[PDB]
Each structure stands twice: as C-alpha cells, then as structure tokens.
Amino acid sequence: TFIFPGDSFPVDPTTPVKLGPGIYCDPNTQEIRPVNTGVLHVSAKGKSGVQTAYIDYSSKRYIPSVNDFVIGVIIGTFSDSYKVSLQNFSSSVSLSYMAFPNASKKNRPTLQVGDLVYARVCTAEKELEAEIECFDSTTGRDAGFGILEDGMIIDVNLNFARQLLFNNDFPLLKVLAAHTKFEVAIGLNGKIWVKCEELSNTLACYRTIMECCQKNDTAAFKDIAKRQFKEILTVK
Amino acid sequence: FQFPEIAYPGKLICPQYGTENKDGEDIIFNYVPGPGTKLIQYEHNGRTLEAITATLVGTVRCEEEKRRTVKNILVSVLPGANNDFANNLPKEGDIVLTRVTRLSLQRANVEILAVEDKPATFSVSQASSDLGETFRGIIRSQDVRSTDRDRVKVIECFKPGDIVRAQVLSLGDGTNYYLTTARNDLGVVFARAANGAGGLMYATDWQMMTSPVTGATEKRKCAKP
Amino acid sequence: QNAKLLANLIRDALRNIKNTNEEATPIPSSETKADGILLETISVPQIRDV
RNA sequence: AUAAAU
Question: Cβ A27–B197 below 8 Å, yes or no?
Fold first, then answer.
C-alpha cells in the first residue's frame, strides 16, 4: 500500500496521531498529511485511544531529530564546542565539550579535527542550530559513543541505514559475520563505520555494503559477500 | 527677530556669542549649534570669525534650555508625505523595534527597523533588507529577562521573523548593538504561528503567546501594552 | 588569635571612608563658572566691532 | 595550584 503526498488519510480528525518521518502537520490548517512517498507504517497500542505513524521513504539528505544516532566529522573547534558536520553541504551541528564522560571546565577533550565520532542528537530545532551529545542517556549507563579510530566510513541512503540499525531481520550484518570479524557503527544520518583487523577485510566489507546499498536485494547480498571476499583473495 | 525665521543651507543666522541690555544689567545669550545648524569659521579682511550657519532648508526655532543673570539658547533649523530622519540614531537608553534574523544558543541577533522617539511616534530607518546595509543588533541571553538571568532557553523566548521591542544598553561593536528585554514593556510584539506560516498571534501572559484563530499557543517573551 | 586586631583594624578602616564622602558635593558646581571666565576675558568692545 | 579566553 504505497502512499503518495497529498494522499487522503483514513484516520478521524478528533483522534490524534503521533508524528512520524514522512508525516506533516500543517501549522496553518492543523491537518495531518503525508509529504513523502513510500510505505506507511502504523502502530496501534491498547484496545482504544492511542496511535502512531510514519512513512518509510527513500531519502538521502539527513535532517536532525531528537534521539537519532549519527556519525559526524569534526571540521573545526570553537570556544566551548566542536563544529561537526554530519553530512556534506549540510548545516553544522553544535557538540558541547561538556558533553563527554568525566568532563570538566579545566580539561577539554583530546578530539582533533578530522576525527570520527559516534553521537546522538539531543536538541534539534528547525530554526535553531542542532546539537549532539557523545553520551545518550536512553541507551544505558554507558553510551558506547566515543570517537572512532581508523576504519572506513560508508555513504548510505537513510532508508538503508535505518533498516540496518532497527531491523534484526536484515541479513547484512549476518552475512558479513559469516566471512570475517568486524565492528560496526551505524548512523541514522546515512553513515556506516566499518573496521577489521586487516585492511583487506575492511575493504571487502566496504565493497559489499556499497553493492548492498546499490543492489537492495536480500538474495543478492548473501551471494554478493561471497564474490567480494573471493575477489580479494585473488587480488591479494 | 534679529535672525531670519527661515534659513537655506549656507545662510548666516547668528554669531558665536550675544548680549543685550536690560534692567540695568548685561544678559549674556549663549548661542549653541543644533540639528540643522553647524558652527563654522568665516574670515573677512584678514579677520577670523565663528558664526552659526544653517545646513538644512527650514524655518528657524530657538528655545531656552539649562547679582548677574545667565542664559542658554538652542538654535536649530526644522524642515518646512516623505520622511528621512537621519539625525536619529540608536543611542544608549532608546527603545528600538527589531526583527529576528537568526537564532543561536547563547544569544539572538536581530536587525534594527525603527526607533521610538521622545515625548507614541517612531522613526523608521529605511534600508535594504536583502543586502545587509540595515543596522544589526545582538540580544544576549542574559539580557532576555530579569527573572533567572543565568539559565534562559532562547528557543522558548524568540523566533525567526518575530518582532521584538527592546532597549539598547550600549553601542557595542560595529557589528552588533546590545539589546535588553528585561523590563515589562519589552519583548515580542508581533508574531505568527510556525515561524510566520500560521495565523497571527497576540500577547496574553508575559511568557506565553496565544492565537485566537487556530487555537495555537507558542512560548515567547511577550511585553505589556 | 589576631581577631582582636582585625576588629580594631575594621574600626581603624572605618574612619577613613567617612572623611571622603562630605568633600565630594562641592566639586561639581564650578564648571559653568569656568565657562564664564572666557566671556569676561573677551572684550565687550570687539563684539560691537565684529 | 601542572598549564584559561582559534
């Protein structure tokens, strides 16, 4: 059931629906209407009285939202924060120095410009500069957010990244584990960080994820990893 | 009566100092330059001389402002619709209507549109808003309100496009003027819902702005009529 | 141990502050008068000449 | 009080 922009909505006006990506609430007419093209996903809880929705659509330009995991690059340093850009040609984001474990006004973090960081967006307003924090409260006692070292970063459309982070039925992480050991950071801003013990394995992972990003096939991806890790052998 | 009522630019009005004889005592009239006048130097026959000269085409008005008596007269020239008003410039203590251009975390920069006069009437500064020739000003986060000066959420106070009535504490640098909305009569005056996308909103509470049209309520810093 | 001295010191300190305040009012007034002297110095005779 | 306002 594909949904297009300007599409009629079945739900009644009196009963509210929680906002989801793709769904837009008009500030003027107060009507709730879809603005993106894709599959509508709705979750209903309880016998009656509450609802939630969003649209899974193909987009690649990230827009910061509360509680979104993103991988950013710190281009430059200001007085009290880092300037980090999640994406190219995109507005800069404000990362606080005090947004680190064991922070102090006397000792600034040792992060240098060009370092990769795993971060979550705390406050994101449409008309204000967005802000991220190294540690996210929601995940647990320890965020696991620290600047990445070495590895390789991969560009990926927002849909592919969201499926890789929230969907456990996505075979990509499984088919890569069947070939080599690897650690992976996943950003909702369409960035994927991959690192192995050897470069040839990281490179092989890069090439697979890229093709998987291109291919978008469950059947292809299992084979894709096969021919990729094979091709590295001969290339060696 | 001695000085011409109306003077064109470059017309001599009155010398530097003046005096008269009344009640058996010399009264000293001190002539001081004003808006429309300029004290310059003229020399005749090798003799130096300073006299008040009008610089604007207007009727001329004098007004007194402050043993042996003592006096002070203010000489000025007033022109006499289109209004220019250049003499008017943001100075410490004046009230100024501004519009929010951008929002940051620790401050909020705007641009100066009009300036409140003195006894309401205003002086509109005409400039191009699509160039940047318009005077820019910055409202600090500590100058938002007297209540809790330390922690102030700028997102819940102002908004891009909202009109803010403020008072300039100081000139600052060439880039930003200093603006405070600490008092009651200062704050967001005119604003619309959703950054101007929705309908008009009016000021009810000092920290709450509502819209009696769509029933929308947004958190702003409102002033008092 | 030197708290008695400190109490004495505060009393010693206090007297000086008081002396300064009385003096200050006088100083402001003179300025218009200073402006007067220049007019006095200039000859009345010239003014009729110019 | 072990290195402060790119």
Answer: yes
With beta carbons less than 8 A apart as the criterion, state whether B179 and B98 touch. Answer: yes
Which residues of chain A are within 8 Å of residue B216 when distances are taken between CB atoms?
27, 30
A34 CB burial (10 A radius; 0-12, 13-18, 19+): buried
Q: Classify residue B75 as exposed, middle or buried by CB count within 10 Å of its CB (0-12, 13-18, 19+).
A: buried
Q: Provide the H-helix boundaries in chain B.
A: none
Structure tokens at A208: 């697979």
A105 CB inside 7 Å of strand D: no
Q: Report the CATH number that the domain containing residue A210 is assigned in CATH.
A: 3.30.1370.10
Total tally of structural domains belonging to chain A = 3
Q: In what order do the strands lie in the sheet with A183-187?
A: A152-155, A191-195, A183-187
Residues 6+ apart with CB under 8 A from A211: A220, A221, A224, A228
**CATH architecture, domain B4-80:** Beta Barrel (2.40)
Q: Minimal CA–CA distance to B205: which of B130, B147, B119?
A: B147
Best mutation target among B105, B109, B154 (most A Cβ atoms within 10 Å) is B105
The angle formed by the CA atoms of residues A139, A104 and A95, to the nearest 5 degrees, is: 55
C37 CA from D5 C1′ (Å): 51
Q: What are phi and psi of A24, to 5 degrees?
A: -125, 135
Domain with CATH 2.40.50.140 in chain B: 83-225
- Dihedral of CA B34/B38/B40/B44: which sign? negative
**Whole-angstrom distance between the N-terminal and C-terminal Cα of chain C?**
79
Interface contacts (B, C; CB < 8 Å): 11
Q: The dihedral of CA C11, C16, C18, C19: what is its sign?
A: positive
As a whole number of Å, the end-to-end CA separation of chain A is 47
Q: Which nucleotide is nearest to A77 (CA to C1')?
A: D6
Structural domain of A53: 1-59
Q: What is the resolution of this structure in A?
A: 4.6
Neighbours of chain A (3+ CB pairs under 8 A): B
Contacts of A19 (CB under 8 A, 6+ apart): A25, A54
Query: What's the CA gap between A80 and A94, in Å, rounded?
Result: 9
* Contact with chain B for residue C27, Cβ under 8 A: no
**Distance between CA B82 and CA B84 in Å, rounded?**
7
Parallel, antiparallel, or unpaired: how do β-strands A191-195 and A147-148 relate? unpaired
CA atoms of B125 and B123, how far apart (whole Å): 6
Strand D proximal to A126 Cβ, under 7 A: no
